[PDB]
Amino acid sequence: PRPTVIITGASSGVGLYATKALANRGWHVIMACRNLEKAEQAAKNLQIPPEAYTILHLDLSSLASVRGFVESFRALNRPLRALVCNAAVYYPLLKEPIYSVDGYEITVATNHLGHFLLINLLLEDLKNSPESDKRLVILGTVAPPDLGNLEGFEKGFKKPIAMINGKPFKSGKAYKDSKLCNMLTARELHRRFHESTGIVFNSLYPGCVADTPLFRHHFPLFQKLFPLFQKKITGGYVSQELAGERVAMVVADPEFRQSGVHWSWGNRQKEKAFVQELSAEASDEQKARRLWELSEKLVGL
Template sequence: MSTPPRTILVTGSTSGLGCELARQYAAEPGHLILHGRNPIKLRKLVEGLSGAVARISTVEADLADLAQVRQLADAVPTLTDSLSVLVNNAGIGQGRGNVREESVDGLELRLAVNHLAPFALTLSLLPLLRAGDPARVVNVASAAQTPVDFADPQLTARYSGSRAYAQSKFAMIATGFYLARLLPAEEITVNSLHPATLMPTPMVAEGWGTTVDDLATGVAAVRHLIDSPTLAGVSGRYFSRQEVTDALPEAHDPEVQRHLWRLSEEWSGVRFPG
């Protein structure tokens, strides 16, 4: 049974996992909206998809800048009146060394890019996702998870790149669980996943320098959440590759989720509509 044409937005599409998702979905009917930070890389990506079956659009934004995240959210409705799938794939790894960095908005950089940007983008695009009913939100997270220290959520003390990365992915997963409860699963599903372990991507090469799984494993895991008919109406889950599993226990704690949600709305300036 073939899948009806869909409108799919993939963030971080110019390298690694996002690039391969772009290549594969370009070969299928539908509308593919590809996000990137670098206009030259975006142009080269599109040039490489010259034989695409899908209609291709591009959007640019640096997700370390909340103003640009808002501009991205404003740009998407000029390209489509509905979204079938939002893949929050863009992110940064632990980096080299343990040098704390901040976003344009003065927020810890990994928390800003890996969590707050997709948080703000998803909430801003809910009207388009509702119009794409049934729609799916897929958060590309990680098995590397560390609870947010609410006494020092921006890691101004005892900073490490690995903790910052793991904390940002924890926040993405925990608030994803919370959002799933706010949305009717028959209209919009929200799921997170660990796609694979240390795939051969630029982010892994910079931060870890070694690989375990191949890229195809991660792509198949993400495509499972996007495509599988068995996941229709399945929401508020965490997957390791293609299997439902538990995230870190604290991520399932409703009070932790609520606290992170309130902080995320405060930091991002974007609130759940209604």
């Protein structure tokens, strides 16, 4: 009997190597991906044992697809022990915003809003599971990110709104903004549900995984040289395998069962995890709650 874990965006990068590390630990991985062929080719190239994973379609940019995936997973009749919100898109140099089928700027829609709906639906499945060590793990972070007063969300977040704070569109900051929402969501998940469910709600920063397709929308020269830069200059480089293994630790290792925490190993890498409380910024306490409320409104809860 294999414990089940859902990993979004498992077809490459951190999610792919997290699938391999969890599979090697005896978990069964739900690879929730939007590109089924790309995901299947990725698992076979790594020779991940086929009995350790199953691939289901999930497009986080479509709220109907999120709801559809939840039904598809429930039809598996597999109790859920863990959910990893890993998928993301990064546009550093996108001039004009792209809007999802539901009408939302694609970076926030994919990175935050789709995950926000998935989390709220799958919370039922995590509650009902008989496992005692259940975890919800969110991939976080370490143009600075600024949500302002959530004016863009406060006003419905439809075009021409393209930023959470209502300011004009900046694709790179939109990514930073979306990962900030991931942290605040992990912070709200713990505050709202940990004492009453026993589920562990954590975020994690594995380091600079300079090799992943996250930089696919960057200049081709950037993708070629960023690993060497991160390796020989900043020292913040981490391999895809090490990042995947760190996700698996926070999901499965007993040393990481404390809830409401952000795990990291530093900006510059050595050769030991740091604990940071998610509610540390006490002045973001109300903005975190309103973000949650506005997100419930945007995804139709």
